[PDB]
Amino acid sequence: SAPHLDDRVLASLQEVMEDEYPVLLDTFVLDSEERLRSLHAALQAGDAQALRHTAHSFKGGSSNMGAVLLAGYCKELEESARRGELQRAPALIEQMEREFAIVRILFKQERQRYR
Amino acid sequence: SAPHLDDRVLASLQEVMEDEYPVLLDTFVLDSEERLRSLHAALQAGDAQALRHTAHSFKGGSSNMGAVLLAGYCKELEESARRGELQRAPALIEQMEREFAIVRILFKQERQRYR
Amino acid sequence: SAPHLDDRVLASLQEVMEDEYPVLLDTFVLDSEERLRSLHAALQAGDAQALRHTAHSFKGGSSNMGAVLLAGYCKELEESARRGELQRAPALIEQMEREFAIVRILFKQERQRYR
């Protein structure tokens, strides 16, 4: 569902990947759960460069899977961590967890349609 | 306290239930905690059916105990779940956690008035 | 920094404290975390007087370290708890967790500037 998922991106991806598509949804969830775990760890440690790195990785994985609002927040975190501006990091991690839970349920529902 | 609790639902329940009333405050809290744990488990499984049927009971339990804002969220989650419109489920669950925490402390305050 | 930290309260404190300044950043984090844990335990017990007493301490400790928005939420909790008005307690505790998370990462950033 828009505006959380850009059907543009995912319609093309499903068409190419065929039975790999359900594996990409499952993998996206696992890889994003590990990214969020890494961001919380980086936030507690006050590790700006780890926040920036992981944010940038997450931005790309989000964009690959048409999770465009999630990739937006990842970009914000990457750019502010790059400035050393960390005030917003807790609230952006929160925004990422609330947006990621939408994408996760949408992916778990779409996954159910496949064997 | 309005708008969280409808004092006239509760005043009627007090008058009817007499000595049972404090026991109902206590079991509303434990029952609702369990219903929230089951909604989280249902959301992490992507089980729209388990979301729908836990939301509908919590709606009634909330209604029964004059928690009318909490009941209005449960109603929204039940309907969402029945339709399969899961994009709102994470946000509605969090709204039901923040509104239940209000009801919980009001009911713990009220329970202190009884042996 | 602003509006979360009043930099001049802190500029005066580091001028006075010199070498002890980084210890105070560390201490403030640990003191504040234990007081949040105390607030949550008081909220789950429906203990208005524990909420009021811990809220008052935290207001002072926040104020001493230029965390003026955090101290504002603590003041709101102290005043409402004294009046036995506990309907806003859950929300105010959550506002103090989100604001504290900002002060925490800014203090962990600054602490890395010292041995």
Residue numbers in the entry:
A (entry chain C), B (entry chain B), C (entry chain A): 2 to 116
Any passages from the paper?
In Pseudomonas aeruginosa, an important opportunistic pathogen that causes numerous acute and chronic infections, the hybrid two-component system (TCS) regulates the swarming ability and biofilm formation with a multistep phospho­relay, and consists of hybrid-sensor histidine kinase (HK), histidine-containing phospho­transfer protein (Hpt) and response regulator (RR). HptB, the target protein in this work, is closely related to biofilm formation, which could increase drug resistance and protect the cell from pinocytosis by the host. According to previous studies, after the sensor proteins PA1611, PA1976 and PA2824 are auto­phospho­rylated, the phospho­ryl group is transferred to HptB and subsequently to the downstream RR protein PA3346 as illustrated in Fig. 1. In this work, two crystal structures of HptB and the receiver domain of HK PA1611 (PA1611REC) of P. aeruginosa have been determined in order to elucidate their interactions for the transfer of the phospho­ryl group. The HptB–PA1611REC complex is further modeled to analyze the binding surface and interactions between the two proteins.
Then, we successfully crystallized the native HptB in another tetragonal space group, P43212, with six protein molecules in one asymmetric unit. The crystal structure of native HptB was subsequently determined with the mutant HptB structure as an initial model and refined to high resolution (1.58 Å). The structural differences between mutant and native HptB are small, with an RMSD of 0.15 Å. The structures of six native HptBs in one asymmetric unit are essentially the same, with a small RMSD of 0.16 Å overall for the Cα atoms [Fig. 3(b)]. The structure of HptB comprises five α-helices and folds into an elongated α-helical bundle with an up-and-down topology. The helices α2 (Tyr22–Gln45), α3 (Ala49–Asn65), α4 (Val69–Arg83) and α5 (Ala90–Arg112) are twisted around the central axis and form an antiparallel four-helix bundle. Residues Ala46–Asp48, Met66–Ala68 and Arg84–Arg89 form short turns between helices α2–α3, α3–α4 and α4–α5, respectively. The four-helix bundle is covered with the short N-terminal helix α1 (Asp8–Met18) which protrudes into the solvent environment and connects to helix α2 with a 310 helix (Glu19–Glu21) [Fig. 3(c)]. In HptB, this conserved histidine residue, His57, is located near the middle of helix α3. The imidazole side chain of His57 protrudes from the bundle and is exposed to solvent [Figs. 3(c) and 3(d)]. The hydrogen-bonding linkages between Lys60 and Glu79 prohibit their side chains from shielding the imidazole ring of the active-site histidine. High solvent accessibility of the imidazole ring is achieved through the nearby small side-chain volume, which results from the highly conserved glycine residue (Gly61 in HptB) at position +4 from the active-site histidine.
